[PDB]
Amino acid sequence: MAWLILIIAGIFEVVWAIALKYSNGFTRLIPSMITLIGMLISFYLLSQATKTLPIGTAYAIWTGIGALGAVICGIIFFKEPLTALRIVFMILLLTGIIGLKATS
Amino acid sequence: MAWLILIIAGIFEVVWAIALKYSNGFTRLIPSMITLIGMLISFYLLSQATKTLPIGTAYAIWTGIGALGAVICGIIFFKEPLTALRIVFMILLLTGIIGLKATS
Amino acid sequence: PTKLEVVAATPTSLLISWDAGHWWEWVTYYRITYGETGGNSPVQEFTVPGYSSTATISGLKPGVDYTITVYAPTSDYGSPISINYRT
Amino acid sequence: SSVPTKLEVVAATPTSLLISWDAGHWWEWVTYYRITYGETGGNSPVQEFTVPGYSSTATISGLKPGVDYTITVYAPTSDYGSPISINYRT
Ligand SMILES: CCCCCCCCCCCCP(C)(C)=O
Ligand SMILES: N=C(N)Nc1ccccc1
């Protein structure tokens, strides 16, 4: 069960990620509010998911969904680039991230 | 410049991460203030970076530098196991980050 | 913002109120500045959270014509709102 | 214990006591202290307040003159030390 609230900890990671983009340097109320609230949901949801699970596999999947969700919802909502190159260096960055967090 | 801010956001990402373990229940004053100051700086700099940079690239690179600093600090200041796996994950990470800056 | 009214005033203070917009337009903070419409010197300023649409300006000289302006965080919204008012 | 240290009454008045402590070294400084005071007997409860951890002194007001009190300074947690108390008749 703690796995799923780890998934959701990870979805809310993307939520504040997109809400923060929408806030325009944290100046638009509501996207600003979502950013804050959707953060301590992620962190809280984590600390509970982590209670049960390994800290390593917890964070690895938490930030994985965080980082990929941001990349995906970005190219979608903010019509951010979709270069052959960008999708590649993003893959090396997320695996390095996932990697180092899965070692600790 | 936006990129420079991200690096410093990532730097402060880890300084509050490691200061938060050196705070107790958020009880030791000096570590508590450092975590609190390191988070407000980390978020702020990130929010300002996200104005001019894709949320997908901003998040992942931010997270990356935090994950990288975390292991660079983990290895050096805590005698942490330095694996050939850990080095290649730090190389993928760096290649990911450098790579993304190069497709601006 | 829009609709900068002086809802109430005493000789020494004004209660101002504005239209935040709705939903998508709400900003996280407003920055209100007030000074003598004339010899000014500087202007006093303060900031109110963006959820609040009223503000109170205190320590005014009675009888003096003051000018009040309400800023958004950035230009990219709907310009500053300004008024004059004698206390 | 470790913290807090050296709980003493700096100044006193029939109704009010001004207390101080040695927060300790920077790394021992805590986010707050919670401070308890009541008649050293306990006719019903005790009285309590907290102080920011960056403060080494606290004033206690509204005491009954002539009465012996107990005054206890705690840390946030028990991790740091045993909560140091003193007796004082106003
Ligand atoms: C909760 C921590 C982040 C605090 C940031 C406050 C948001 C407003 C940023 C405005 C200042 C920079 P500017 C005048 C270029 O918009
Ligand atoms: N929630 C995170 N991924 N990071 C974080 C770091 C610093 C301040 C606030 C949030």
Numbering used by the authors:
A (entry chain A), B (entry chain B): 1 to 104
C (entry chain D): 6 to 92
D (entry chain C): 3 to 92
Sentences from the paper on this structure:
Membrane proteins from the small multidrug resistance (SMR) family are a major driver of the spread of drug resistance genes among bacteria. The other group was characterized more recently, and encompasses guanidinium (Gdm+)/H+ antiporters (Gdx proteins; E. coli gene name sugE). The two 4-TM helix subunits of Gdx-Clo are arranged antiparallel with respect to each other in non-equivalent “A” and “B” conformations. Transport by the antiparallel SMR proteins involves a conformational swap between the two structurally distinct monomers, which seals the substrate binding site on one side of the membrane while opening an identical site on the opposite side.
In order to visualize substrate coordination, we solved a structure of the Gdx-Clo/L10 monobody complex together with a non-natural transported substrate, phenylGdm+, since this compound’s bulky phenyl group would aid modeling of the substrate. We observed conspicuous density near the glutamates, to which we fit one phenylGdm+ molecule. The guanidinyl group of phenylGdm+ is also in close proximity to the opposite E13A sidechain. However, E13A is deflected downward by a cross-subunit interaction with Y59B, so that the angle between the nitrogen, hydrogen (coplanar with the guanidinyl group), and oxygen atoms is not optimal for H-bond formation. Based on our Gdx-Clo structure, we propose that Y59B and the guanidinium group compete for E13A, and that displacement of Y59B by the guanidinyl group initiates the transport motion. Y59F, which cannot form a hydrogen bond with the E13 carboxylate, is not competent for substrate exchange, in accord with the requirement for an H-bond at this position. It is also notable that E13 only forms a single hydrogen bond with the Gdm+ ion.
